[PDB]
Design a protein around this nucleic acid. Sequence first.
RNA 1: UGGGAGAGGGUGGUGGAAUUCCCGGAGUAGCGGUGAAAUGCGCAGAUACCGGGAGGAACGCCGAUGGCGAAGGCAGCCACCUGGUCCACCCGUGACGCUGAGGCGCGAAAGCGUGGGGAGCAAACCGGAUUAGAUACCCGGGUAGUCCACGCCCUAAACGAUGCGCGCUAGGUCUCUGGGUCUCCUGGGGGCCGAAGCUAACGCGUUAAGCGCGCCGCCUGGGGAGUACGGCCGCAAGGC
Lengths: 114, 275, 88, 68, 100
Amino acid sequence: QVASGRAYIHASYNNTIVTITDPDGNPITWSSGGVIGYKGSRKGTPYAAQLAALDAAKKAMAYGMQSVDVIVRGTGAGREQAIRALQASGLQVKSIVDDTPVPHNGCRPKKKFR
Amino acid sequence: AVKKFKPYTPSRRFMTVADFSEITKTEPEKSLVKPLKKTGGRNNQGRITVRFRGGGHKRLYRIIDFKRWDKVGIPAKVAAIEYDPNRSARIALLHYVDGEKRYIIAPDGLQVGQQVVAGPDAPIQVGNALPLRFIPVGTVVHAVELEPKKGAKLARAAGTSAQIQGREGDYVILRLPSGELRKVHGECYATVGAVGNADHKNIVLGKAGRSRWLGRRPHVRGAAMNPVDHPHGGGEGRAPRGRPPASPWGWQTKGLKTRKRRKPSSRFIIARRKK
Amino acid sequence: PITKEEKQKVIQEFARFPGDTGSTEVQVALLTLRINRLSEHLKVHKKDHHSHRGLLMMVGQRRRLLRYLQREDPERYRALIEKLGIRG
Amino acid sequence: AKVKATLGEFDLRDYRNVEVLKRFLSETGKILPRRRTGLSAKEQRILAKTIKRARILGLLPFTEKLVR
Amino acid sequence: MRRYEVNIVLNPNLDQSQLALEKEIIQRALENYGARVEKVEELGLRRLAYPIAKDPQGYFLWYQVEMPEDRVNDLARELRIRDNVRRVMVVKSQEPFLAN
RNA sequence: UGGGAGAGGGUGGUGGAAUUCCCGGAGUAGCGGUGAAAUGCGCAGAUACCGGGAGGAACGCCGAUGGCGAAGGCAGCCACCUGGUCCACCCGUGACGCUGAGGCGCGAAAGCGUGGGGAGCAAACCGGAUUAGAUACCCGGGUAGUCCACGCCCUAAACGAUGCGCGCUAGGUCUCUGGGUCUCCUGGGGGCCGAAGCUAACGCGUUAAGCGCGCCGCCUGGGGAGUACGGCCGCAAGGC
Ligand SMILES: [Mg+2]
Ligand SMILES: [Mg+2]
Ligand SMILES: [Mg+2]
Ligand SMILES: [Mg+2]
Ligand SMILES: [Mg+2]
Ligand SMILES: [Mg+2]
Ligand SMILES: [Mg+2]
Ligand SMILES: [Mg+2]
Ligand SMILES: [Mg+2]
Ligand SMILES: [Mg+2]
Ligand SMILES: [Mg+2]
Ligand SMILES: [Mg+2]
Ligand SMILES: [Mg+2]
Ligand SMILES: [Mg+2]
Ligand SMILES: [Mg+2]
Ligand SMILES: [Mg+2]
Ligand SMILES: [Mg+2]
Ligand SMILES: [Mg+2]
Ligand SMILES: [Mg+2]
Ligand SMILES: [Mg+2]
Ligand SMILES: [Mg+2]
Ligand SMILES: [Mg+2]
Ligand SMILES: [Mg+2]
Ligand SMILES: [Mg+2]
Ligand SMILES: [Mg+2]
Ligand SMILES: [Mg+2]
Ligand SMILES: [Mg+2]
Ligand SMILES: [Mg+2]
Ligand SMILES: [Mg+2]
Ligand SMILES: [Mg+2]
Ligand SMILES: [Mg+2]
Ligand SMILES: [Mg+2]
Ligand SMILES: [Mg+2]
Ligand SMILES: [Mg+2]
Ligand SMILES: [Mg+2]
Ligand SMILES: [Mg+2]
Ligand SMILES: [Mg+2]
Ligand SMILES: [Mg+2]
Ligand SMILES: [Mg+2]
Ligand SMILES: [Mg+2]
Ligand SMILES: [Mg+2]
Ligand SMILES: [Mg+2]
Ligand SMILES: [Mg+2]
Ligand SMILES: [Mg+2]
Ligand SMILES: [Mg+2]
Ligand SMILES: [Mg+2]
Ligand SMILES: [Mg+2]
Ligand SMILES: [Mg+2]
Ligand SMILES: [Mg+2]
Ligand SMILES: [Mg+2]
Ligand SMILES: [Mg+2]
Ligand SMILES: [Mg+2]
Ligand SMILES: [Mg+2]
Ligand SMILES: [Mg+2]
Ligand SMILES: [Mg+2]
Ligand SMILES: [Mg+2]
Ligand SMILES: [Mg+2]
Ligand SMILES: [Mg+2]
Ligand SMILES: [Mg+2]
Ligand SMILES: [Mg+2]
Ligand SMILES: [Mg+2]
Ligand SMILES: [Mg+2]
Ligand SMILES: [Mg+2]
Ligand SMILES: [Mg+2]
Ligand SMILES: [Mg+2]
Ligand SMILES: [Mg+2]
Ligand SMILES: [Mg+2]
Ligand SMILES: [Mg+2]
Ligand SMILES: [Mg+2]
Ligand SMILES: [Mg+2]
Ligand SMILES: [Mg+2]
Ligand SMILES: [Mg+2]
Ligand SMILES: [Mg+2]
Ligand SMILES: [Mg+2]
Ligand SMILES: [Mg+2]
Ligand SMILES: [Mg+2]
Ligand SMILES: [Mg+2]
Ligand SMILES: [Mg+2]
Ligand SMILES: [Mg+2]
Ligand SMILES: [Mg+2]
Ligand SMILES: [Mg+2]
Ligand SMILES: [Mg+2]
Ligand SMILES: [Mg+2]
Ligand SMILES: [Mg+2]
Ligand SMILES: [Mg+2]
Ligand SMILES: [Mg+2]
Ligand SMILES: [Mg+2]
Ligand SMILES: [Mg+2]
Ligand SMILES: [Mg+2]
Ligand SMILES: [Mg+2]
Ligand SMILES: [Mg+2]
Ligand SMILES: [Mg+2]
Ligand SMILES: [Mg+2]
């Protein structure tokens, strides 16, 4: 049980994954579009991200967490709705940072990205 | 740079020879040679225990200094680089300011007239030897001891080298010539640089006779034999292997691992060779 | 590169009179200097094809000066190439 | 609000002037476009190249997390 | 010859004695390669923008040496051998370029 | 002689982001992927998160309609070696020039040889979809190769589909880079619109496709055919 921690939002075009971690980054719980029951294209929607962030926040709040720092990676659809869902959850959103990985022109991407 | 021949005999068409360009002395130091006792692959019982050996050119053994921590702090001048018939590397004659003369295996880029020295204080320069713990990570080394004061065992063949990858306690981690990753004690000595004569691997013997000069007698296939002789022996006409390919003694020879399982050094090996 | 001093010395050694800075002798010698230093560069950098074009241009430039100096005064020409060891 | 006006004299080649060069960087650490720096073509190349040396010395960041 | 600026970053957790020895190695190396120090600026500890060698700080040196051009690469290599030297940038000196 | 700008070239170093793999931790029911899916991956602990390590390749912002090169082509940063080119002075030489059949050198990618390297990608190949079918497009895998050295190959929508040099024939506007007396002017580049003129038209138009001179290369109906034969070149593929 810890009150302060982090909330990671991994948001791609296919899915949204929320991971609530301790202050040092060690995961405490997590949820996603698949955990709240969706399969396929459905779990990439904003609503799917919303249920995922609430189900992750509720589990996190159930170990005594009250304030998180929010780290956002990726430019998927359900991104903003996941951030709303965290705020309007009972958890105190103490910060918001977009830590999306961007290569300084690194590995050749797949065909679909050219 | 390996040298080719014009095809004025059928064997000269592909035969290649080393250029011998780094060699500056054609006679060995008389006090540092001793007779190399030829075995024909036979042991003290007179039995062949390594097949197909013998008949090679007479050779004298050049005494090689595989310790060097023998003479910490005492510098030496590289007097000469010479041919050694007993190894693929070339050898380098060292003249210590002591007056003592010694042979080391010749590193790549070693230069006649340069000085070298061994010890924990030696510059990180080609030809110098230091305990592993004082050579910086990333340095490529050769003539590495495996255990402190037991003599250089690793990376001695032409062109080979090991690379220091990290430190962990009393041990350093090396990438061995084989690609294996291994802890080696930090007090083990190494020489900075890779072994020279890196074009060794590109030599084409060219003819059966050249293997014979090297003491390699013809190797006869198991499939060419009879069932008394070999698992692959016999069959009417040619035969495929008709069973898992095997050694003369019956054990399998495509993939079967043979390193002893409970060997104490396994605690010191991090990753088995990959290629 | 070539230093300012190194160039002046070549100029004085081949100037046809005080302060001559553009006669055929001075031009050929100046080019012969650059050609020789560039040929030495190319021996080490055999893959510097772009600079090698530079060399052909200088060599062609020096060539046409010599064809001219050889037409106008052979003795000056023969002396100049030997004073530089050219004879192609 | 263009950067170059908000500064007096500065050496476009001084790769150690953190306090000045730091101002030519987006809040995410990227080099700022000309419209945001007020620099000409010739000046901006010098700024880019000296920012890069400064980053390699560890004095300027290559990238920053975007804080909301 | 040519005038260069030698930038050096060192381990920020050395005592003043180890730091003294590191500056000794550097100063002799400069000398051994024919580097004529003209100016020198020692800024010491500075919080970096990113961890260099997994540490947020670095001890900065700076020398406005003058030396023969064909030796600066070998000097850079020699200065980099020491595990306590984390960065070396030997840049050419040049006139300031001033805006405003 | 004195200055300038520049991803021009070659060599040696060197920085950070990101991908992948491996290790330690923490954690659990999915992840991934698509138009929708499935194959795939995952309770033998994946995805997501933190720390450590290894290794290859490419260099975000700056970056532009920008710059450089004869063309191919050139982009993190540092140093060394080196080419081309512009300007100002108007100092030197005194037509020393233009072009250029042959020759010689360079020549994207793919391909080849020897030897390295191999993260990501990805011909061939395997599988899932899609579909009437789907030897494809899409998805999950995946070997050459992509990368380095040396040696070959010599092709292209190698294009401005526009050979090089010079002289001459309104301007307007944007821009790069010099020199001014810095508004402005004057050189050298890169574009756009247009005078006269040209053009079958489209369009070109001081960066000509205008008006002229010099020299080179080339065309002479479509297919057969860049084929066949001969020759020359190449290890081959195949090139001329
Ligand atoms: Mg999905
Ligand atoms: Mg990070
Ligand atoms: Mg031959
Ligand atoms: Mg031969
Ligand atoms: Mg011969
Ligand atoms: Mg014959
Ligand atoms: Mg033959
Ligand atoms: Mg020979
Ligand atoms: Mg030799
Ligand atoms: Mg040799
Ligand atoms: Mg003899
Ligand atoms: Mg004896
Ligand atoms: Mg005796
Ligand atoms: Mg013996
Ligand atoms: Mg024996
Ligand atoms: Mg006996
Ligand atoms: Mg007996
Ligand atoms: Mg007996
Ligand atoms: Mg045997
Ligand atoms: Mg035998
Ligand atoms: Mg023998
Ligand atoms: Mg030998
Ligand atoms: Mg121990
Ligand atoms: Mg050999
Ligand atoms: Mg062999
Ligand atoms: Mg054999
Ligand atoms: Mg046999
Ligand atoms: Mg038989
Ligand atoms: Mg028997
Ligand atoms: Mg039997
Ligand atoms: Mg049997
Ligand atoms: Mg059989
Ligand atoms: Mg049979
Ligand atoms: Mg048989
Ligand atoms: Mg049969
Ligand atoms: Mg038989
Ligand atoms: Mg048989
Ligand atoms: Mg047979
Ligand atoms: Mg048969
Ligand atoms: Mg068989
Ligand atoms: Mg059989
Ligand atoms: Mg069988
Ligand atoms: Mg056995
Ligand atoms: Mg052991
Ligand atoms: Mg020239
Ligand atoms: Mg001539
Ligand atoms: Mg400065
Ligand atoms: Mg270091
Ligand atoms: Mg000049
Ligand atoms: Mg793990
Ligand atoms: Mg990790
Ligand atoms: Mg861009
Ligand atoms: Mg352009
Ligand atoms: Mg005049
Ligand atoms: Mg006159
Ligand atoms: Mg011409
Ligand atoms: Mg021709
Ligand atoms: Mg080519
Ligand atoms: Mg290629
Ligand atoms: Mg190939
Ligand atoms: Mg093939
Ligand atoms: Mg190849
Ligand atoms: Mg072959
Ligand atoms: Mg298929
Ligand atoms: Mg069918
Ligand atoms: Mg089907
Ligand atoms: Mg398929
Ligand atoms: Mg695919
Ligand atoms: Mg793949
Ligand atoms: Mg592969
Ligand atoms: Mg293949
Ligand atoms: Mg192959
Ligand atoms: Mg090549
Ligand atoms: Mg084009
Ligand atoms: Mg053109
Ligand atoms: Mg054409
Ligand atoms: Mg024409
Ligand atoms: Mg101006
Ligand atoms: Mg141009
Ligand atoms: Mg113009
Ligand atoms: Mg127009
Ligand atoms: Mg008109
Ligand atoms: Mg006409
Ligand atoms: Mg006009
Ligand atoms: Mg105009
Ligand atoms: Mg033009
Ligand atoms: Mg026309
Ligand atoms: Mg032509
Ligand atoms: Mg016809
Ligand atoms: Mg063809
Ligand atoms: Mg043909
Ligand atoms: Mg033919
Ligand atoms: Mg053609």
